Structure formats: structure tokens, C-alpha cells
Amino acid sequence: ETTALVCDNGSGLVKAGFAGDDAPRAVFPSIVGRPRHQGVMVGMGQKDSYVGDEAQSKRGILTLKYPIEHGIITNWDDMEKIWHHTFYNELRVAPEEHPTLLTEAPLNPKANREKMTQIMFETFNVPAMYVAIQAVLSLYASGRTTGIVLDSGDGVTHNVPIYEGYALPHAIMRLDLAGRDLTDYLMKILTERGYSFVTTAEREIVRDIKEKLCYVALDFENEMATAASSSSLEKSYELPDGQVITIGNERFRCPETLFQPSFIGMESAGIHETTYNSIMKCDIDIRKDLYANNVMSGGTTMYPGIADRMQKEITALAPSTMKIKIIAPPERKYSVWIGGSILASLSTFQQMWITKQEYDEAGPSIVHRKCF
Amino acid sequence: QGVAFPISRDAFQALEKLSKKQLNYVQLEIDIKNETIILANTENTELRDLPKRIPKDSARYHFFLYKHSHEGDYLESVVFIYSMPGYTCSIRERMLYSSCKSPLLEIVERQLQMDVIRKIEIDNGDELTADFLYDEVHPK
Ligand SMILES: Nc1ncnc2c1ncn2[C@@H]1O[C@H](COP(=O)(O)OP(=O)(O)OP(=O)(O)O)[C@@H](O)[C@H]1O
Ligand SMILES: [Ca+2]
């Protein structure tokens, strides 16, 4: 037993863990914090930085940053801290003893893949490591090699057509709207309902509301009308001290924002339109199978009724005689991570790792050749 | 791409014989625990009984000699099929079938000169009708 680590680094959350486990052991915010101003902060500890949960608790003392913007790594100093923290603090492992699988976003620059492998080998001294495309891992996990993945996480929503294990970069759509935007709109319209959520302690509370009560309407105006003229679909939410507030049309208006981004000002096609456009940018031929295999991944696709709604919208955009299916696995919230764990635990995967010797001889990249 | 499970001796002989048109159908399966590709079935199969060959409760790989006419020509072209019935399969079954595909296709091609004309991914193989298969191989 040497054991492989699997890391799926997203904009909002890190999912991390041991290959062969069926769920990620560590899930914590992809947040790095540093002293708010120059001199001596109080009570900054004996430390120059915090990561994850600690960084949230001390938000008042630190300046908070996300090193992964829209799936891409844009702050490497801070990204090193998240990795360090993942190994030592979250996982309790010594990186040099463990093969590490890492995941990457759509449209990720080749140079980024290289510095990523570089840092793993140079700064963390992993014996072996390997890099996999998130979207492909989820597709494969659903039991298919061709289809169009709709990955929607915390800061980005991607539409990614994949043929035979290969993402088609020219047809990949990016939409900068996801979970963190949805929590904030839920916060806004809940406060307009006469409650008050400003406030980072409260944002947490709204995230839980959002995650437990929200749903996607099959027909939105039907549902708005079904709510205005009846108290039928009103769930009550237990505040953590004891107050009880009543939540109504917010319950579906919030993720409606996915299909109707004008809701938060933004001029942009909705997820149904972006997944249609993505498809449309491919072969006339391949299109058939894209439609037939829409896979969904990521926490922001976890809303009830999202699958069916997509079915409705896609159909309405497609040639009438089109075979359309959405696949929304129960495991889709960590399907990217589960797929890496499954892969990195196989004996037959031992000879697929990029090794230190391979990297020395050289160098970083190795990565484009050996991983795809 | 991707993960190479050793193809068993028996399996390899079936595939070889398919390459020479001595067999018309060869079905394979993955042994999850052993990380191995093993021979499931080589029962002689005509188009009209192909649907019956495709399990409805676990995922399989298939190589099928598709005898048919195309505008003057009688063609006997090898079709590959990856069948996956859905959540009756475990995540691990799904990942392995999906992940072990490309290397299996690579060996058959480079070592047996199989001339896989088309690869198809299907849910159950009720789908595998006469016109379906002709449209896959010979689109418009
Ligand atoms: N049951 C749920 N319903 C709705 N949203 C959810 C649910 N569970 C998690 N989420 C949301 O999903 C987001 C996190 O998902 P994920 O981990 O896939 O994103 P990420 O990988 O951090 O970000 P990205 O992929 O955009 O870079 C959070 O905004 C979270 O509130
Ligand atoms: Ca993600």
C-alpha cells in the first residue's frame, strides 16, 4: 500500500481524497486569505496566510482570494497554498510519498498544464502525477465516450462536446454564472421579500436554503401564476437559532436564472441555448449523438427538475424529429472526483503515471503526450 | 487515452477469427476485480438476432460482422458497439468500459488489421434495427 491521491480543484471548492474511496474526503473552499493591511494585524497569528475554512472564519482580518477563476488557475502563489493545505492540513499526507491525479478545466492553456505539473514535481516532489479533463471524467463515468457534458459548478458553467474521449475545444461554450451567483440572487430577492441577508454569516444560511429547497420549474410562468394565487408550494425554513421564515417563488426563480440570466442583469444565452450553440458548432454528423447524450455534472446541476426542463428546452430548439436525452446521475456532484478515484486505484494505472524520471529527462511536457 | 486491460488469449483468438470472417460475432466483457478483458460470447449471429445479444443488465463490448448491400456492393464490414443499459451498472463498471475502450480498439487495429468501419454507443439494442445500422455506416 502506497496510495494515490485524487484532487479536483474547482473555483469554489476543492474536492480531495484517496483513490479507491468512493467519495472525496476533504471538501473545502478554494479560498486563500492574507492580512488586510501592511503592518501588524490583530489577531493574525504567527502566519502569513490562511486557506479554506480558516480563511472564512478570519475573513475580517484577511483579504480573501480565489486562485481559480472560472476553472482556470490565475494566482499561482495562492494555488500553491491550497495544494500545501490539501496535503498537510486536510489530508494529513506527505506529498512526496503519493502519486497525484489532478483535474483540469475546459479551454485550459497548455502553459498552465505545464506549470501545474512543474509545481507538483519541483515544489511538492510527488513521485508521479497525472492530469485529467473534468468533463471527460464525468462523461466516462456515466458510461459513454461521446456526448456533450454540461458542467456547472461554483463560478463557471461549461458546455463541452466530447468525441471518443476528446473534448472539441472549438465547440466549447463558457458561461460565467453558477452557484455563487445563485446564492447571491437568492440572497437579493429574499431580502426584497422583506427579510434581511447581507452578510457573510447569512450568505452561508442562504446557501443551505438554496441547496435544500430550490427547484427548477418545468414551466416558469405556470409556476409564477401557481404561486401568486395560492400558498400551495411554500416550504418553511428553520433558521439555526429558532426563527422560521417562509420561502415561496424564490424557490424556483433562483435557478431559473440559469435559463434566464437577464434575471441578474447579464445579457447572455441561457444554459439550454449555450448547449444548443455548442452542439451547432460541431459536425452536422456528430450532432445526432450529442443530443442523445447530454450528461450533467457539478453542484449547480443538482436542482430537482433541471433534467426535465433541459429536455423541454432542448427539444424546443431541435429539429422536431430529434432523439434527445439528458443524463443526470445521482453522483454527479462528485462524478469528476469519483472517476479519478476509480482510475487511480487500478493496478493497470501504475504505468500511466508521469514519473519523476520521465519529468527529469525531460520535462513538463511530458504532460500533453503522456496523458491524452 | 486510456487504460489497457490485458485481452485474454481466448478473446484474442475470437477477434482474430472475426478479422478473417471465420466468426461473425464476438462479445467481450471486462472482469472488474482482475482488470482483464475476457471472452463472453461468439455465438453466430445474423442482423436479425443481434438485439438479443445485447445484455439489458450489464455493459458489454461487441464486434459484429455487418453483412449488407451498399449501392451495388455487398459489404461485410466490422462494426464495434459499446452497450450500456444505464444505472443497472455501477459507477466502476461504467468507468472501466468507457475507459478501456480506446486501447482495445488500438490493438485490434494495429495487430489484426480489423477494419472497424464504425463505433456505436447504445443503451439496449432494441435500437439495433436494419435501417439504424445502415444509417450509422452510410450516412447522407
Ligand atoms: N444540492 C444542491 N443544489 C444546488 N446547488 C448545489 C447543491 N450542492 C452544491 N451546490 C452548489 O454547487 C456549487 C459547488 O459545485 P462544484 O464543487 O461542482 O463547483 P466548483 O468545482 O467549485 O466550481 P466550478 O466548476 O464552477 O469551478 C456551490 O455553489 C454549491 O452551493
Ligand atoms: Ca468543477
Using the beta-carbon criterion (under 8 Å), do A339 and B89 form an inter-chain contact? no
Does residue A155 have its Cβ closer than 6 Å to ligand 1? yes
End-to-end CA distance of chain B: 30
Q: Which helix (H) or strand (E) holds B106?
A: helix B101-112
Helical axes B91-99 vs B101-112, angle rounded to 10° = 30
Does residue A178 have its Cβ closer than 6 Å to ligand 1? yes
Does residue A335 have its Cβ closer than 6 Å to ligand 1? no
CATH class, domain B1-140, is alpha beta
- The answer to whether residues A275 and A282 touch, using CB atoms and an 8 Å cutoff, is no
Integer Cα distance of B48 and B50 in angstroms: 6
Instruction: Work out which ligand 1 atom sits closest to the CA atom of A8.
Output: 21
Q: Which helix (H) or strand (E) holds A279?
A: helix A271-280
Which chain A residues are within 8 Å of B98, Cβ to Cβ? Answer: 139-145
**A77: alpha, beta or left? (left if phi > 0; alpha if psi -120 to 50):** alpha
Integer Cα distance of B86 and A330 in angstroms: 12
**A277: alpha, beta or left? (left if phi > 0; alpha if psi -120 to 50):** alpha
End-to-end CA distance of chain A: 27
Using the beta-carbon criterion (under 8 Å), do A143 and B93 form an inter-chain contact? yes
CATH topology of domain A3-31+68-131+334-370: Nucleotidyltransferase; domain 5 (3.30.420)
Instruction: Work out which ligand 1 atom sits closest to the CA atom of A151.
Output: 25
DSSP A302-339: -STTHHHHHHHHHHHHS-TT----EE--TTTTSHHHHH
Integer Cα distance of A135 and A145 in angstroms: 11
Cell reading at A138: 464525468
DSSP B22-58: S-SEEEEEEETTTTEEEEEE-----GGGSGGGS-SSS
- The answer to whether residues B66 and B137 touch, using CB atoms and an 8 Å cutoff, is yes
Q: Which helix (H) or strand (E) holds A76?
A: helix A76-84
Query: Phi then psi for B38, rounded to 5 degrees?
Result: -120, 155
Q: Which residues of A89-107 are buried (b: 16+ CB within 10 A; e: fewer)?
A: ebbebebeebbbbbbbbbe
Strands (E), chain A: 5-9, 13-18, 26-29, 32-35, 50-51, 62-65, 68-69, 72-73, 100-104, 128-133, 147-152, 157-163, 166-167, 173-175, 235-238, 244-247, 294-297, 326-327, 354-355
Q: Which helix (H) or strand (E) holds B60?
A: strand B60-70
Tell me the CB-side half-sphere exposure of residue B108, using CA atoms within 13 A.
Answer: 30
User: How far is CA A50 from each of CA A81, A95, A216, rounded to the nearest angstrom?
Assistant: 8, 19, 36
Q: Quote the minimal CA–CA distance from A120 to chain B in Å.
A: 22
Integer Cα distance of B59 and A254 in angstroms: 38
Method: X-ray
With respect to CATH, is domain A179-264 assigned 3.30.930.20?
no
- The answer to whether residues A140 and A339 touch, using CB atoms and an 8 Å cutoff, is yes
Q: Write the residue in A293, A335, A343 that is nearest to B3 by C-beta.
A: A343
Query: Phi then psi for A214, rounded to 5 degrees?
Result: -55, 155
Collapsing DSSP states into helix, strand and coil, what is residue A192?
Answer: helix
Cell reading at A233: 408550494
C-alpha angle A365-A367-A369 in degrees, rounded to nearest 5: 90
Note the residue count of chain A: 372
A289–chain B Cβ distance below 8 A for any pair: yes
Cell reading at A239: 433558521
Helical axes A220-228 vs A250-259, angle rounded to 10° = 160
User: How far is CA A3 from each of CA A96, A246, A355, A356, B100, rounded to the nearest angstrom?
Assistant: 11, 48, 15, 17, 22
A contact residues 184-243, partner B, Cβ 8 Å cutoff: none
Q: Domain coordinates of chain A in residue numbers?
A: 3-31+68-131+334-370, 32-65, 133-178+268-329, 179-264
User: How far is CA A262 from each of CA A153, B31, B98, rounded to the nearest angstrom?
Assistant: 19, 50, 38
Using alpha carbons, select from B55, B2, B12, B7 the residue that is nearest to residue B31: B7
- The answer to whether residues B91 and A342 touch, using CB atoms and an 8 Å cutoff, is yes
- The answer to whether residues A52 and A14 touch, using CB atoms and an 8 Å cutoff, is yes
Residues with CB under 5 A from ligand 2 (ion): A 10, 153
Q: Which amino acid is at B34?
A: N
Cell reading at A351: 504505468
Q: Domain coordinates of chain B in residue numbers?
A: 1-140
User: How far is CA B37 from each of CA A289, A341, B8, B89, rounded to the nearest angstrom?
Assistant: 27, 21, 6, 17
Q: Confirm whether A3-31+68-131+334-370 and A133-178+268-329 share one CATH topology.
A: yes
Query: A32-65 falls under which CATH superfamily?
Result: Actin; Chain A, domain 2 (2.30.36.70)
Q: Give the chain A residue nearest B101 (alpha carbons).
A: A145
Q: Which residues contact A231 (CB under 8 A, 6 or more apart)?
A: A248
Interface probe, candidates B32, B98, B124, chain A, greatest A C-beta count within 10 A:
B98
Using alpha carbons, select from A171, A172, A103 the residue that is nearest to residue A140: A103
CA A345 vs. chain centroid, Å, equals: 23
Query: A133-178+268-329 falls under which CATH superfamily?
Result: ATPase, nucleotide binding domain (3.30.420.40)
- The answer to whether residues A336 and A97 touch, using CB atoms and an 8 Å cutoff, is no
Using alpha carbons, select from A126, A121, A154, A182 the residue that is nearest to residue A9: A154
Integer Cα distance of A264 and A182 in angstroms: 9
Using the beta-carbon criterion (under 8 Å), do A141 and B93 form an inter-chain contact? no
DSSP A250-278: HHHHHHHHHH-GGGGS-----HHHHHHHH
Does residue A90 have its Cβ closer than 6 Å to ligand 1? no
- The answer to whether residues B93 and B59 touch, using CB atoms and an 8 Å cutoff, is yes
Atom 21 (ligand 1) nearest CA: A10
DSSP structural state of residue B100: T
DSSP structural state of residue B87: T
**A118: alpha, beta or left? (left if phi > 0; alpha if psi -120 to 50):** alpha
Integer Cα distance of B47 and B38 in angstroms: 23
Integer Cα distance of B51 and A105 in angstroms: 38
Beta bridge partners of A72: A69
Say whether the peptide bond before residue A362 is cis (omega within 30 degrees of 0): yes
Q: Which residues of A236-249 are buried (b: 16+ CB within 10 A; e: fewer)?
A: ebeeeeeeeeebeb
Q: Which helix (H) or strand (E) holds B75?
A: strand B73-83
Does residue A179 have its Cβ closer than 6 Å to ligand 1? yes
- The answer to whether residues A345 and A21 touch, using CB atoms and an 8 Å cutoff, is no
Locate cell 444554459: which residue? A271
Which chain A residues are within 8 Å of B124, Cβ to Cβ? Answer: none
Integer Cα distance of B16 and A139 in angstroms: 31
Instruction: Work out which ligand 1 atom sits closest to the CA atom of A207.
Output: 31
